[PDB]
Ligand binder design. Structure first.
Ligand SMILES: OC[C@H]1O[C@@H](O[C@H]2[C@H](O)[C@@H](O)[C@@H](O)O[C@@H]2CO)[C@H](O)[C@@H](O)[C@H]1O
Ligand SMILES: OC[C@H]1O[C@@H](O[C@H]2[C@H](O)[C@@H](O)[C@H](O)O[C@@H]2CO)[C@H](O)[C@@H](O)[C@H]1O
Ligand code: ZN
Length: 284
């Protein structure tokens, strides 16, 4: 069983990794590097919340042409720095950063490409905390016990085992096709669509509705700001189920609430994704 994800955690952030790091554990970080608020950010796998002991410090730096520093801190002492002289991140752009823990190292992938392989210097069992600081904003941090990035056929239909309930979250990472017209995300119950999320680029709107016995209800189109999705750009979306409504955020920014119309939450046990996007991650 994998622990629940951290949704839109505020930076600086520090959170427990339930059960500590384990061989086969994959930690996914979806966020966006700030456009004009600093020149570096870091993701740390550490022991406790002090910072004196960081088993793995992943530090992208938008300095001197861009590079990334990897190191370990033990009892306040930094070890030999391991640097990658190329920068896979971009200011103002969302990213998919995944850490795969293995017996001898951390496999670090950025937007689907293996970027760094960091051999353990400190026993990975001693890591019980993940922290994030710097010029970055977070959408979510998820956990999954293990392909790190499998191919998702479109449309993608999958079962939400156990269905919905208060505190249940659904996560999605993908990319809007450059030529995208629209795409949708449905949470279904039998022959009904409990929740329909439909971003439309041509209409420049994000439509939400419910379909009962093939009949659509009142459309909800409210948005706190401009269209959050961009053509050709990667994105992340999380849907949090509460007793009275669903809360939806895109790239870490709350977009809206959608009060339940179909109330038997456990029956909402199917997720369907279709349209003009490519999927990267899905957690149900
Ligand atoms: O409410 C979601 C469904 O909308 C349908 O289109 C609506 C359209 O949004 C509205 O402006 C009006 O023209 O009525 C249409 C038909 O109901 C979509 O066709 C359907 O796929 C859902 O997205
Ligand atoms: O090594 C990780 C650690 O680096 C510190 O900065 C280093 C710097 O990278 C190096 O070139 C210089 O010789 O020493 C500095 C201090 O050790 C950062 O300050 C720290 O936050 C970590 O990123
Ligand atoms: Zn990933």
């Amino acid at each position: 069983g994998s622990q629940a994800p951290y949704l839109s955690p505020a930076v600086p952030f520090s959170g427990t990794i339930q059960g500590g790091l384990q061989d086969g554990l994959q930690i996914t970080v979806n966020g966006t590097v700030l456009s004009s608020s600093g020149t570096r950010f870091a993701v740390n796998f550490q022991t406790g919340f002090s910072g004196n002991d960081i088993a793995f410090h992943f530090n992208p730096r938008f300095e001197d042409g861009g590079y990334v520093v990897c190191n370990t801190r033990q009892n306040g002492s930094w070890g030999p720095e391991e640097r990658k002289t190329h920068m896979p991140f971009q200011k103002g752009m969302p990213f998919d950063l995944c850490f795969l823990v293995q017996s001898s190292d951390f496999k670090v992938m950025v937007n689907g490409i293996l970027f760094v392989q960091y051999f353990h210097r400190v026993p990975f069992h001693r890591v019980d905390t993940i922290s994030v600081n710097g010029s970055v904003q977070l959408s979510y941090i998820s956990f999954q016990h293990m392909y790190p990035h499998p191919a998702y056929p479109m449309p993608f239909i999958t079962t939400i085992l156990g269905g919905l309930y208060p505190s249940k979250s659904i996560l999605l990472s993908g990319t809007v096709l450059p030529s995208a017209q629209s795409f949708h995300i449905n949470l279904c119950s039998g022959n009904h669509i409990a929740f329909h999320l439909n971003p439309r680029f041509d209409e420049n709107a994000v439509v939400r509705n419910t379909q009962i016995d093939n009949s659509w209800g009142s459309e909800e189109r409210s948005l706190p700001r401009k269209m959050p999705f961009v053509r050709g750009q990667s994105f992340s979306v999380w849907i949090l189920c509460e007793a009275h409504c669903l809360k939806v955020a895109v790239d870490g920014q709350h977009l809206f609430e959608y009060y339940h119309r179909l109330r038997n939450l456990p029956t909402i046990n199917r997720l369907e994704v279709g349209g003009d996007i490519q999927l990267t991650h899905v957690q149900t």
